[PDB]
Homo-oligomer: A and B are copies of this chain.
Amino acid sequence: EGMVSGGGTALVNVISKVSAVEAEGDVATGIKIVVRALEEPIRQIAENAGYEGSVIVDKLKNVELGTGFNAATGEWVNMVEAGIVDPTKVTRSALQNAASVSALLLTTEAVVADKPEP
């Protein structure tokens, strides 16, 4: 596949293109929901390091492409230069699986499960 920015930076880097997709009604809502959810990995990583996730997300949305947040040091550097790189296949496979299974679960309406034995 190739190499892309690690640490979830690539996920935020594609937010603009997703928001650019045109839809209406529930389709537009489904677009917005994915737009919101795509920020979860980077925000969670920032919170785990003690940094405020919202601040990191907002700053990342306004920096040049290829520059992200180094959770190890808390400094905004070039991930490619700093070696914080993740395979494209891993990210795209995770996104595809999560989206597909979330779509399957959201359409569930009746659950048949074994009653716990008293």
* Residues of chain B with a CB closer than 8 A to A52's CB: 54, 58
Give how many copies assemble into the complex. 3
Interface size for chain A: under 10, 10 to 19, 20 to 34, or 35 or more residues?
Answer: under 10
Interface of A: prevailing SS: helix
A79 to B14, CA, bound (A): 35
Does A63 have its Cβ within 8 Å of any Cβ on chain B? Answer: no
Q: Which residue on chain B has the smallest CB distance to residue A58?
A: B55
Q: Scoring A residues 19 to 63 as 1 if CB is less than 8 Å from chain B, else 0, what string do you get? A: 000000000000000000000000000000000101100110000
Q: How far apart are A74's CB and chain B's nearest CB, in angstroms?
A: 12
Binding site for B on A (CB under 8 A): 52, 54-55, 58-59
Cross-chain pairs A/B with CB under 8 angstroms, 8 sampled: A52-B54, A52-B58, A54-B54, A54-B55, A55-B55, A55-B58, A58-B58, A58-B59
